[PDB]
Amino acid sequence: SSIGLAHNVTILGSGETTVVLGHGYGTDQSVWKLLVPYLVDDYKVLLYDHMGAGTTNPDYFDFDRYSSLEGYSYDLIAILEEFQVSKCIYVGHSMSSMAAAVASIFRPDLFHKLVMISPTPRLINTEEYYGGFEQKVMDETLRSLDENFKSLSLGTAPLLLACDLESAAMQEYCRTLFNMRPDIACCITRMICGLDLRPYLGHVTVPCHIIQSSNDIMVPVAVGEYLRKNLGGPSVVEVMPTEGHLPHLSMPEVTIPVVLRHIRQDI
Ligand SMILES: [Mg+2]
Ligand SMILES: [Mg+2]
Structure with a gap:
């Protein structure tokens, strides 16, 4: 499987229903290592690495394909078809x-x-939408980016994860963050910060379980309610008693039971 190898696909567990686990920026499928053992006896589990992750081949990273988010959406579709999900x-x-x-x-x-x-x-x-970053504030960061990539990559990590440099979560996050090729991580960083999915949320019809930290510098709690009001299908919002943008990594004791509940229960 050429697509399975390029994305380091792993298949665990068994069952009629498959849980697919997709990681965020700067991590890979290993971020789910504490959640997977609670799923395998009741679901087949599919784990994949998004293109651009440190565990994937840099040469495969098409800068135009992954300058828009649906480039990742097409990869996910190709993986799901290849593995008969x-x-x-x-x-x-x-x-x-x-x-x-x-x-x-x-x-x-x-x-x-x-x-x-x-x-x-x-x-x-914008004038109606508070995403958490003013245009001027975001612009004077992205110009910094590759000239000062190390300072921005690590300097924003404690505020992003909301945990200490000595913590295991920060250590594990930086382990995978530091493995990305800088020009790949700048391209991906520039896509996320420039992303506007608002015009299309009304065409999402599949049920969506929205899990949040009560304090996430990257996601104001109102963004979750915005998603819920603008998605075109059913949705539920749970604001966890957590802080930071990666609560599944930094606070698994709170987050994992929340994730399991929303996996097991339908809206
Ligand atoms: Mg081959
Ligand atoms: Mg992300």
Whole structure:
């Protein structure tokens, strides 16, 4: 399988229903290592690495394909078809779940529901939409980017994860963050910050479980309610007693039981 190897696909567990696990920026499928053992006896589990992750071949990273989020959506579709999966339960962190939302638009037959950890359709504020970052504030960061990539990559990590440099979560996050090729991570960073999925949320019809931290510098709690009001299908919002943008990594004791509930229960 050329597509399975390029994305380091792993298949665990068994069952009529498949849980697909998609990771966020700067991580890979190993971020799910504490959730997977609670799924394998009741579901088949599919794990894949998004293109551009440190565990994938840099040469495969097409800068135009992955300058728009649906480039990732098409990869997900190709993986699901290759491994004979339909009507899956997709669990995704951050733009991975947004890539699966758009994937569900193209191929509703591939998704039974979406469990979304810290999703946002747009980071930039406008006159009606508070994404958490003013245009001027975001612009004077992206110009920094490759000239000061190390400082931005690591310097924003403690605020993003909301945990210490000595913590295991920060250590594990930086382990995978530091393996990305800088020009790939700048391209992906520039796509996420420039993303505006708001015009298309009404065409997402698959049920969506929106899981949030009560304090996420990247996702204001109102962004979750915005998603819920603008998705075209059913949705539920759960704001966890967590902080940081990667609560499945930094606070698994709270987050994993929440994720399992939304995996097991339908809206
Ligand atoms: Mg071959
Ligand atoms: Mg992300």
